[PDB]
């Protein structure tokens, strides 16, 4: 042979890369060995390492012991050569030529070497780049590669210790196979055999999004998974600055021509991950010169309706991409249901959203890291004080919490293989099963046991934002079929307003501009304000509250479909309200002893959602601001009263709870009225009897690639929350940006 015996090689007469032997053939050799179309090695050099009597046999056996321990892939001289002998390839640093050069065999490539390389740098640019370089760009080129590239010293490696390196794009021979410089809430990768955790990715498996966008790696994914995994790690170790191709390339360390493929591909993958919002997001803001996506994406215009978390998330993204965005907001402020009172001494208290439920991988957690801000993790302790002063017996709460969960356990048994039509309110179902235990057991509940049960139901009502007789037994917890956000529940101490303001910074936002009509029967979208001002763009994104879609505040033309409307009306616009009280001194410290909150056992069944729980707004235990919630039927019981009457009502409750002392009068308070705020009229969505969690998906479907929908009530995995809304913003920005 003076030619390659592998089917279809573009090399009629090959050169050896290795030079391991003195007997290294330009010339004839029994067999050539094919690694790539531009890269071959002779049988002398093959014998050099493979054969006992030869010199390189030492190296190869050493290497094959290491490779068998760490990796799953089979040791072989081909493998050895690809891992250990093939030359490195480096592009030039200087922008004039940027030509790819081969390094001499005796030199190991490193990040700093690849950062600062000019043509012919021994430890010049007029010489023409190697023939094989342009051939690397061909489709089939990757097809004629014996082995998938394996990366050396990958930033992702510490994160991936539980996997075999080769099963995940990495070299099992690399010495460098909670990490330093990484937030405890950033866990981007699933561990092997780990149950559902929100936003995690499998490092060894392409996701469906990735398969559809990159179907060429359906056959062989390992080059993809290596580069994705690297990028994710680069992003999560340095999430305050834009990840760019320039910053990635120095971390791709693999020998051979395949390195050039890697470098060219890393750019497409990066843009895909940016658009999707997996990388280069949060409150990262880019300067006016720079944009996160290339000029191709920029010939699009968007108007975004609503400037809550959903509308702001989408705006920020699209802005950062280089797309033209303008935001129209009904109120005289941004934030929607994020609205923070800054006027209390020391602490900061939200009128809407303030807790984060599950920080791990939560985009809110990433934004807190970016702005260097604090989250207070909630403690477990919450004692239930009764109207009178008696902290409930520990063995009473424990067992009523048990009984409560068993009811729900019976509900989920009941609901199997039922249909929307067979559905029934969760509240009815609960009490039915409740009466059954009474009857079939014979044992009855005391007045206290009953009161403590009621507290637990009110927590459900708080969670749903409704009386349980409105909430679907079949589907109330639908979203839990999906992976939820793991980790800490935290109080967001400086408030979500810091985040909301940062997101908003330097965007085209029009306040006091409610939209009245949206016309998309034309070529352009036509958007009209209540006063009459007109805006037009190629695409529009509605992010208004569920309750306003239900009231039909906006005229759509064409109207929404009967399907969309059935979706919209099958969900409930849930409601809670809050009260915040200031005091001169912390009157609860003695009794409460530094818990984040304390319970309140409802005196009667009909007073159930009336200040069920009081939150201590100072993690520092210095200031005296309490916060409390009104939920369920209690919200109805408070519709008529004015703030003062409510405040008194709250005060009656506190003096009864803290009987054994003098309760000081409040110096400062607010009472929230979200339900009557004409542009909001709710706190969060929930599934009504008869409904399905598919409603979210339906509400989320764009009309004719021009009208798009984001928001709290469009996020099936993560309904109700700032995180959910934010993520729906990022999801829609991604579709809008596409093509």
């Amino acid at each position: 042979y003076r030619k390659c015996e592998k089917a279809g090689c573009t090399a009629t007469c090959p050169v050896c890369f290795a030079s391991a032997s003195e007997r290294c053939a330009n010339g004839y050799t029994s067999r050539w060995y094919h690694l790539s179309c531009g890269e071959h090695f002779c049988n002398e050099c093959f014998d050099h390492y493979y054969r006992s009597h030869k010199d390189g046999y030492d190296k190869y056996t050493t290497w094959k012991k290491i490779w068998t321990s760490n990796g799953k892939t089979e040791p072989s001289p081909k493998a050895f050569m690809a891992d250990q002998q093939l030359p490195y390839w480096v592009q030039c640093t200087k922008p004039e030529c940027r030509k790819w050069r081969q390094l001499t065999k005796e030199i190991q490539l490193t990040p700093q070497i690849a950062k600062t390389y000019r043509c012919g740098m021994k430890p010049h640019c007029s010489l023409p780049e190697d023939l094989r370089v342009l051939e690397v760009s061909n489709h089939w080129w990757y097809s004629m590669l014996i082995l998938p590239p394996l990366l050396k010293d990958s930033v992702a490696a510490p994160l991936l210790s539980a996997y075999y390196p080769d099963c995940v794009g990495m070299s099992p021979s690399c010495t460098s196979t909670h990490v330093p410089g990484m937030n405890r809430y950033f866990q981007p990768f699933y561990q092997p055999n780990e149950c559902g955790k929100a936003l995690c990715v499998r490092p060894d498996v392409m996701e469906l999004d990735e398969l559809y966008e990159f179907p060429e790696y359906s056959r062989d994914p390992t080059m993809y998974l290596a580069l994705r995994n690297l990028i994710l790690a680069l992003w999560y170790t340095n999430c305050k600055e834009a990840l760019t191709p320039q910053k990635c390339i120095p971390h791709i360390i693999v020998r051979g021509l395949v390195r050039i493929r890697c470098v060219q591909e890393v750019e497409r993958i990066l843009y895909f991950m940016t658009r999707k919002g997996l990388i280069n997001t949060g409150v990262l803001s880019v300067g006016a010169d720079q944009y996160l996506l290339p000029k191709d994406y920029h010939n699009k215009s968007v108007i975004i309706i609503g400037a809550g978390p959903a509308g702001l998330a989408a705006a920020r993204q699209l802005h950062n991409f280089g797309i033209k965005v303008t935001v129209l907001e009904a109120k005289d402020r941004i934030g929607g249901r994020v609205w923070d009172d800054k006027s209390f001494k020391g602490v900061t208290v939200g009128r809407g959203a303030q807790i984060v439920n599950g920080c791990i991988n939560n985009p809110v957690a990433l934004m807190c890291e970016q702005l260097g801000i604090s989250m207070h993790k909630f403690g477990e302790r919450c004692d239930l004080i009764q109207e009178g002063g008696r902290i409930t017996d520990p063995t009473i709460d424990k067992r009523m919490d048990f009984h409560f969960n068993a009811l729900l356990d019976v509900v989920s048994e009941w609901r199997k293989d039922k249909t929307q039509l067979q559905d029934v309110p969760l509240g009815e179902k609960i009490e039915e099963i409740y009466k059954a235990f009474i009857k079939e057991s014979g044992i009855q509940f005391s007045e206290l046991e009953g009161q403590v049960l009621q507290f637990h139901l009110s927590n459900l009502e708080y969670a749903c934002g409704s009386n349980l007789h409105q909430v679907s037994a079949r589907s109330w917890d639908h979203n839990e079929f999906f992976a939820q956000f793991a980790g800490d529940h935290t109080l967001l101490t400086p408030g979500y307003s810091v985040i909301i303001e940062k997101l908003a910074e330097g965007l085209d936002i029009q306040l006091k501009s409610p939209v009245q009509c949206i016309d998309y029967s034309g070529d352009e979208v036509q958007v009209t304000t209540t006063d009459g001002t007109g805006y037009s763009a190629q695409k529009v994104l509605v992010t208004v509250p569920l309750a306003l879609l239900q009231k039909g505040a906006i005229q759509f033309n064409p109207p929404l479909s009967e399907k969309k409307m059935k979706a919209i009306n099958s969900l409930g616009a849930g409601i809670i309200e809050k009260i915040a009280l200031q005091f001169p001194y912390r009157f609860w410290d003695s009794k409460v002893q530094g818990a984040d909150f304390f319970g309140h056992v409802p005196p009667s069944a009909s007073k159930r959602g009336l200040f069920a729980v009081f939150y201590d707004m100072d993690p520092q235990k210095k200031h005296s601001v309490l916060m409390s919630v009104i939920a369920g039927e209690a919200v109805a019981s408070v519709r008529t009263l004015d703030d003062k009457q409510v405040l008194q009502q709250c005060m009656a409750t506190l003096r009864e709870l803290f009987k054994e002392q003098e309760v000081p009068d409040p110096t400062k308070y607010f009472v929230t009225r979200w339900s009557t705020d004409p542009w909001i009229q709710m706190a969060y969505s929930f599934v009504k009897t008869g409904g399905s969690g598919e409603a979210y998906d339906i509400i989320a479907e764009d009309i004719q690639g021009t009208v798009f929908f984001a928001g709290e009530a469009t996020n099936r995995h993560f309904p109700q929350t700032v995180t959910g809304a934010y993520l729906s913003g990022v999801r829609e920005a991604s579709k809008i940006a596409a093509f």
């Binding site: 807790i355 439920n357 599950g358 909630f378 509900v411 927590n459 459900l460 839990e480 984040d596 319970g599």
Partner: peptide, 13 residues
């Protein structure tokens, strides 16, 4: 959704 519960959350099913 119960994913809104912070204090004394349900483990129902």
């Amino acid at each position: 959704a119960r994913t809104m519960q912070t204090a004394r959350k349900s483990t129902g099913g």
